[PDB]
Design a protein around this ligand. Structure first.
Ligand SMILES: [Mg+2]
Ligand SMILES: [Mg+2]
Ligand SMILES: [Mg+2]
Ligand SMILES: [Mg+2]
Ligand SMILES: [Mg+2]
Ligand SMILES: [Mg+2]
Ligand SMILES: [Mg+2]
Ligand SMILES: [Mg+2]
Ligand SMILES: [Mg+2]
Ligand SMILES: [Mg+2]
Ligand SMILES: [Mg+2]
Ligand SMILES: [Mg+2]
Ligand SMILES: [Mg+2]
Ligand SMILES: [Mg+2]
Ligand SMILES: [Mg+2]
Ligand SMILES: [Mg+2]
Ligand SMILES: [Mg+2]
Ligand SMILES: [Mg+2]
Ligand SMILES: [Mg+2]
Ligand SMILES: [Mg+2]
Ligand SMILES: [Mg+2]
Ligand SMILES: [Mg+2]
Ligand SMILES: [Mg+2]
Ligand SMILES: [Mg+2]
Ligand SMILES: [Mg+2]
Ligand SMILES: [Mg+2]
Ligand SMILES: [Mg+2]
Ligand SMILES: [Mg+2]
Ligand SMILES: [Mg+2]
Ligand SMILES: [Mg+2]
Ligand SMILES: [Mg+2]
Ligand SMILES: [Mg+2]
Ligand SMILES: [Mg+2]
Ligand SMILES: [Mg+2]
Ligand SMILES: [Mg+2]
Ligand SMILES: [Mg+2]
Ligand SMILES: [Mg+2]
Ligand SMILES: [Mg+2]
Ligand SMILES: [Mg+2]
Ligand SMILES: [Mg+2]
Ligand SMILES: [Mg+2]
Ligand SMILES: [Mg+2]
Ligand SMILES: [Mg+2]
Ligand SMILES: [Mg+2]
Ligand SMILES: [Mg+2]
Ligand SMILES: [Mg+2]
Ligand SMILES: [Mg+2]
Ligand SMILES: [Mg+2]
Ligand SMILES: [Mg+2]
Ligand SMILES: [Mg+2]
Ligand SMILES: [Mg+2]
Ligand SMILES: [Mg+2]
Ligand SMILES: [Mg+2]
Ligand SMILES: [Mg+2]
Ligand SMILES: [Mg+2]
Ligand SMILES: [Mg+2]
Ligand SMILES: [Mg+2]
Ligand SMILES: [Mg+2]
Ligand SMILES: [Mg+2]
Ligand SMILES: [Mg+2]
Ligand SMILES: [Mg+2]
Ligand SMILES: [Mg+2]
Ligand SMILES: [Mg+2]
Ligand SMILES: [Mg+2]
Ligand SMILES: [Mg+2]
Ligand SMILES: [Mg+2]
Ligand SMILES: [Mg+2]
Ligand SMILES: [Mg+2]
Ligand SMILES: [Mg+2]
Ligand SMILES: [Mg+2]
Ligand SMILES: [Mg+2]
Ligand SMILES: [Mg+2]
Ligand SMILES: [Mg+2]
Ligand SMILES: [Mg+2]
Ligand SMILES: [Mg+2]
Ligand SMILES: [Mg+2]
Ligand SMILES: [Mg+2]
Ligand SMILES: [Mg+2]
Ligand SMILES: [Mg+2]
Ligand SMILES: [Mg+2]
Ligand SMILES: [Mg+2]
Ligand SMILES: [Mg+2]
Ligand SMILES: [Mg+2]
Ligand SMILES: [Mg+2]
Ligand SMILES: [Mg+2]
Ligand SMILES: [Mg+2]
Ligand SMILES: [Mg+2]
Ligand SMILES: [Mg+2]
Ligand SMILES: [Mg+2]
Ligand SMILES: [Mg+2]
Ligand SMILES: [Mg+2]
Ligand SMILES: [Mg+2]
Ligand SMILES: [Mg+2]
Ligand SMILES: [Mg+2]
Ligand SMILES: [Mg+2]
Ligand SMILES: [Mg+2]
Ligand SMILES: [Mg+2]
Ligand SMILES: [Mg+2]
Ligand SMILES: [Mg+2]
Ligand SMILES: [Mg+2]
Ligand SMILES: [Mg+2]
Ligand SMILES: [Mg+2]
Ligand SMILES: [Mg+2]
Ligand SMILES: [Mg+2]
Ligand SMILES: [Mg+2]
Ligand SMILES: [Mg+2]
Ligand SMILES: [Mg+2]
Ligand SMILES: [Mg+2]
Ligand SMILES: [Mg+2]
Ligand SMILES: [Mg+2]
Ligand SMILES: [Mg+2]
Ligand SMILES: [Mg+2]
Ligand SMILES: [Mg+2]
Ligand SMILES: [Mg+2]
Ligand SMILES: [Mg+2]
Ligand SMILES: [Mg+2]
Ligand SMILES: [Mg+2]
Ligand SMILES: [Mg+2]
Ligand SMILES: [Mg+2]
Ligand SMILES: [Mg+2]
Ligand SMILES: [Mg+2]
Ligand SMILES: [Mg+2]
Ligand SMILES: [Mg+2]
Ligand SMILES: [Mg+2]
Ligand SMILES: [Mg+2]
Ligand SMILES: [Mg+2]
Ligand SMILES: [Mg+2]
Ligand SMILES: [Mg+2]
Ligand SMILES: [Mg+2]
Ligand SMILES: [Mg+2]
Ligand SMILES: [Mg+2]
Ligand SMILES: [Mg+2]
Lengths: 59, 88
RNA sequence: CGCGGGGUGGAGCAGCCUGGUAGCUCGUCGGGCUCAUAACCCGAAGGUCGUCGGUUCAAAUCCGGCCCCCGCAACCA
RNA sequence: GCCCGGAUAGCUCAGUCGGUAGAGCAGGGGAUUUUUAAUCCCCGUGUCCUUGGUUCGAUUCCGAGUCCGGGCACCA
RNA sequence: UUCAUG
RNA sequence: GAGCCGGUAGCGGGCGUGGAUCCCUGGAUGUCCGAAUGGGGGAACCCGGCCGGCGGGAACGCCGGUCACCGCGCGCGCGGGGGGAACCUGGGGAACUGAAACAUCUCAGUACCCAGAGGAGAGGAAAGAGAAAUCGACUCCCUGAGUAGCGGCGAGCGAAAGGGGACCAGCCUAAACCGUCCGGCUUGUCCGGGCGGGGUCGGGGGCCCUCGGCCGAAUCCCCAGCCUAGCCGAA
RNA sequence: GUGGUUCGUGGAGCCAUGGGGGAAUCUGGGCGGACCACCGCCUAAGGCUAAGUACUCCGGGUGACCGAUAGCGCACCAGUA
RNA sequence: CGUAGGGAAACCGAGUCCGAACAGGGCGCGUCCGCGGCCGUGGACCCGAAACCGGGCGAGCUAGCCCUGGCCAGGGUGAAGCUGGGGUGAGACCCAGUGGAGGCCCGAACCGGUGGGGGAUGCAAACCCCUCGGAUGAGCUGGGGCUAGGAGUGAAAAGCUAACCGAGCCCGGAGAUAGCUGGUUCUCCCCGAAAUGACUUUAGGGUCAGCCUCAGGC
RNA sequence: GCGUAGGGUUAGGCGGGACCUAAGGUGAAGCCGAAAGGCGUAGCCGAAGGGCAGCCGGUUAAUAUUCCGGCCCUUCCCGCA
RNA sequence: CUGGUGUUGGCUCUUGGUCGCGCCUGCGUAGGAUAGGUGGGAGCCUGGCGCCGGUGAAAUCCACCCUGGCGCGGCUGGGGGCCUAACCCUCGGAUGGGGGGACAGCGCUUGGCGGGCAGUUUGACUGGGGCGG
RNA sequence: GGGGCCUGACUGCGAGGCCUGCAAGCCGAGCAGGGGCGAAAGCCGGGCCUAGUGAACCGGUGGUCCCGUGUGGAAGGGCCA
């Protein structure tokens, strides 16, 4: 279960650090606390719609 | 039990045995009684606003797929009907 | 009246294994101790292994069966 | 039927993870000994199950076999 | 410190 | 087409060859109960609200509407609810029996219960069947066959292919892509949500420039014919 | 873990699926009775689809069907007393 | 179906198989009807179980409980208190009075049914008479209600649950099953047994042989 | 008291309902069950319990707290104060 | 009742298989001498020999590494905590507050206990049957 | 009873019988392969004989020129022990 991270968290910290957290950890803490979203292909390209607007558009 | 996105529970036989088993020696059966295998059911709680399901817990990712949505409509107070009929 | 269980030293008992190799406690006898009896200690010894008949090389052992003793039953009417 | 563990004295057992064989009890002898135990000192009843084998020499390692104690399993 | 009786 | 006013027999009372009685079809009225449905209810009864109507009257009355609950779409509207002798599908589902006892088994997925549905239901167009460089939806009947098998290999249960027939038929949808639009946001030349357009082994489709192109519904109005009354019918 | 099919654990495939792990979209995927490799077959995880068939409260006709104890339980005011 | 069978099968074929064997031995050639006897699965000759299971119906009887009402004539014993007195340091305590307590006493209704008698095709599918037990309580009883079949309920007897309860009744499976008992319906003619052996979860049943009949061949 | 026919049951005040609840039903909400359905809050139903306005006399063949005679009382609605 | 997994998570403290890593380990002799098994065997640091000599086997250096143990780490299985977000119970009704808390409840599955319930079996000859045989 | 040599406590069959309700049980000369013993005739397919056992099914184990679910092969079967 991969989640895109949106906040700092201890031992999984950066934004877009798509870490395989446990399913209960995803669907119980991060998903009701906004800290992460599920890394399906559609939400992954929804991440990518911001990655293209941030990473290669600062430069 | 229930269904909410899946099919209802089934009916099993039991089929006891008291034997060695073919790849060792002679086999058998004993008693064919009806275990009634109620399917795995978990009350899941999602935050459409306060919504609750009895989802099959091999379908908890499916109900989170159903929640990862915005079906254009506000609160009548209860509303799992528009979450379950705008299911595929 | 029919099952099953015993019989082994004076008594109470181990037992005895396909049969050949028999004992234990107390009692006993003799001693030692003791003023003397107890108790204790030391030496042994004692038995047709229930009679009987059976196969056996050989029976206490195994097979019957008979006499005393024990435990069981003897119910349905 | 397979699977473990074991065969070390009269008995119950440990084994430097090969270079020395051993306890503990029993037995005997010796010391005290009212009685018997207890205590004390010293010796043994020893092919370390059987052979084959690996090693320089085997209780130890390897296999086979025998008895030996179990564990489960069916059982037509 | 043991140990019963005439 | 001459007798009727039901099963009339009796008051005698009327009514009909200007057409009755009857029969059929279409309406109307259908009290009350019943899915019962305004609420209650011990069915065939009580008690209402709103609107409209009769000092018949403001209070009790009665009339005529409308007032259940659920499902579908935008307060608003179309269905559903129960019944049916069997028939059928699904959810459940025994036991006596038979095995000369019985437990696996059989009886049996039988009876029965529940749901659903309709004149049928079911199933259905292949991720099929299995030996054929094969068959080509599904169902039913006969064969296959008591075969292959399953089986305390007991009792028993028992196909499927093939092959004859009946009947015949194929189709819609995200086998993606383009536009649309309440809002999503980190206003993203973009996430999913509803439609719409695409899409169904000149192996399929979408997208990229040659070579352009109408068969026919299960759907709809029609028409025979069929019924639902009857009629003429020889000597 | 079971049900269905001839299949009762068997060599158990297949079709369904209650539990758990959990993919890819045509050099995909399933099936051809464990399985494996060739050769084939066929496209699951969406739905509809007449016709032929079962039935008989119903209406009609038909009877080597009954003729009032028969035939329905009722030929009659019977699912009645 | 039958024309070819052997073998477990591949397969081979008037042969096949066992085998090394060209020893030996095992096995080696009609249907379709009608009709009849008989058998199989059918309910299978008919009647009859005790029962088993599914679905229902009953707590208007009774058993318990819940709610709400009622009922208990009358006497009698005389508890705690309370009052006064005695007592004592104060008391405990003890007297009299008063009081009216009780799963208290006698006792009607009421509830019940102890012993006897009657009743016995009764008056009655539980009665009548005499006599008894309780009778202010664990009472009785009307109404309204609940609980139901392997379940209720039970101050327990396996009692009660719609007159028969060691698991109600009704319908359905179901024409359950019956190795058992009963019964089996016209006439004539011919022939005519057995009750023995083996084996049986078998001894009253059955399979086979023995005895019997029919037809055919010898 | 049986057969035939005809009469006979009169309520603002009696008992119920246009009032209330108890046990228990039913039951929106909510829960749980394969389906039947099983629960269940509020609510509603639920009665010889609460609440509510009547007593006495006469009359026929039958009714009478109903009919009638007297006296009293209750609700509601309208009008006046 | 109980293990496994599901719902079911977070952060820590500790016990084994491990994959290689390596300062290191092996000691009756004759012998400068903290002695392992088998091979490479002509020296390797800025100060140590190999044939010095004797061994069942010569040593140095360096592997394959055996036997471990020591740590360093991922594939880790465990038992002990603390947390709160699943879940559950709650609270003059709260998107909240507690408390329990990844346990319980519940799903599958393993094994067990299991007359509480159920389906049945409990033979026959038998000088009636049972007992006996 | 003793001594010597050995494995016939063989493999294929088996005419013929006995017996019997079937199933079993029992004897079996003879032929072949291949041996034992003996010079040879012969005898030997267990024991002087009648007891010392067990249908089936389901499995195991060792072989096997048999089947192998499209094909090659395995699984699993058969057959022989
Ligand atoms: Mg079986
Ligand atoms: Mg069964
Ligand atoms: Mg949750
Ligand atoms: Mg003696
Ligand atoms: Mg004596
Ligand atoms: Mg003496
Ligand atoms: Mg008696
Ligand atoms: Mg030893
Ligand atoms: Mg010894
Ligand atoms: Mg050791
Ligand atoms: Mg000691
Ligand atoms: Mg000692
Ligand atoms: Mg010594
Ligand atoms: Mg020695
Ligand atoms: Mg050794
Ligand atoms: Mg050695
Ligand atoms: Mg055994
Ligand atoms: Mg002393
Ligand atoms: Mg003394
Ligand atoms: Mg004396
Ligand atoms: Mg004196
Ligand atoms: Mg008339
Ligand atoms: Mg007209
Ligand atoms: Mg007219
Ligand atoms: Mg008319
Ligand atoms: Mg009108
Ligand atoms: Mg109504
Ligand atoms: Mg109602
Ligand atoms: Mg009414
Ligand atoms: Mg007017
Ligand atoms: Mg008016
Ligand atoms: Mg109305
Ligand atoms: Mg329309
Ligand atoms: Mg309906
Ligand atoms: Mg059965
Ligand atoms: Mg039976
Ligand atoms: Mg039986
Ligand atoms: Mg079946
Ligand atoms: Mg149709
Ligand atoms: Mg369909
Ligand atoms: Mg197709
Ligand atoms: Mg067929
Ligand atoms: Mg066909
Ligand atoms: Mg065909
Ligand atoms: Mg066509
Ligand atoms: Mg959109
Ligand atoms: Mg489209
Ligand atoms: Mg092109
Ligand atoms: Mg037309
Ligand atoms: Mg026409
Ligand atoms: Mg007509
Ligand atoms: Mg005419
Ligand atoms: Mg005429
Ligand atoms: Mg088989
Ligand atoms: Mg490809
Ligand atoms: Mg597939
Ligand atoms: Mg296929
Ligand atoms: Mg497959
Ligand atoms: Mg295949
Ligand atoms: Mg159709
Ligand atoms: Mg047809
Ligand atoms: Mg007719
Ligand atoms: Mg006739
Ligand atoms: Mg006639
Ligand atoms: Mg008649
Ligand atoms: Mg009749
Ligand atoms: Mg007559
Ligand atoms: Mg009638
Ligand atoms: Mg021949
Ligand atoms: Mg015939
Ligand atoms: Mg039964
Ligand atoms: Mg009832
Ligand atoms: Mg009652
Ligand atoms: Mg009682
Ligand atoms: Mg007083
Ligand atoms: Mg009193
Ligand atoms: Mg009293
Ligand atoms: Mg009584
Ligand atoms: Mg009486
Ligand atoms: Mg009395
Ligand atoms: Mg009395
Ligand atoms: Mg008394
Ligand atoms: Mg009294
Ligand atoms: Mg009194
Ligand atoms: Mg009562
Ligand atoms: Mg009542
Ligand atoms: Mg009872
Ligand atoms: Mg009764
Ligand atoms: Mg009984
Ligand atoms: Mg019952
Ligand atoms: Mg019967
Ligand atoms: Mg039946
Ligand atoms: Mg004669
Ligand atoms: Mg018999
Ligand atoms: Mg016969
Ligand atoms: Mg004769
Ligand atoms: Mg004959
Ligand atoms: Mg009269
Ligand atoms: Mg009045
Ligand atoms: Mg009143
Ligand atoms: Mg009214
Ligand atoms: Mg009311
Ligand atoms: Mg209430
Ligand atoms: Mg209810
Ligand atoms: Mg209401
Ligand atoms: Mg009242
Ligand atoms: Mg009242
Ligand atoms: Mg009167
Ligand atoms: Mg009156
Ligand atoms: Mg007054
Ligand atoms: Mg830390
Ligand atoms: Mg080391
Ligand atoms: Mg030397
Ligand atoms: Mg170390
Ligand atoms: Mg450590
Ligand atoms: Mg660790
Ligand atoms: Mg904590
Ligand atoms: Mg809280
Ligand atoms: Mg048990
Ligand atoms: Mg029982
Ligand atoms: Mg039975
Ligand atoms: Mg008997
Ligand atoms: Mg007897
Ligand atoms: Mg000799
Ligand atoms: Mg024979
Ligand atoms: Mg034989
Ligand atoms: Mg014999
Ligand atoms: Mg012999
Ligand atoms: Mg069998
Ligand atoms: Mg195939
Ligand atoms: Mg094949
Ligand atoms: Mg052979």
């Amino acid at each position: 279960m991969k989640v895109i991270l949106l906040e700092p968290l201890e031992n999984l910290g950066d934004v877009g650090q798509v870490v395989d957290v446990k399913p209960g950890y995803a669907r119980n803490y991060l998903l009701p606390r906004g800290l992460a979203v599920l890394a399906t292909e559609s939400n992954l390209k929804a991440l990518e719609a911001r990655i293209r607007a941030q990473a290669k558009r600062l430069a | 039990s229930g269904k909410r996105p899946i099919v209802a529970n089934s009916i099993q036989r039991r089929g006891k045995a008291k034997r060695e088993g073919g790849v060792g020696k002679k086999t058998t059966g004993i008693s064919k009684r009806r275990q009634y295998p109620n399917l795995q059911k978990v009350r899941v709680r999602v935050a459409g606003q306060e919504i609750t399901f009895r989802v099959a817990a091999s379908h908890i990712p499916k109900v989170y797929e159903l929640v990862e949505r915005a079906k254009g409509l506000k609160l009548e107070g209860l509303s799992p009907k528009e979450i379950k009929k705008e299911l595929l």
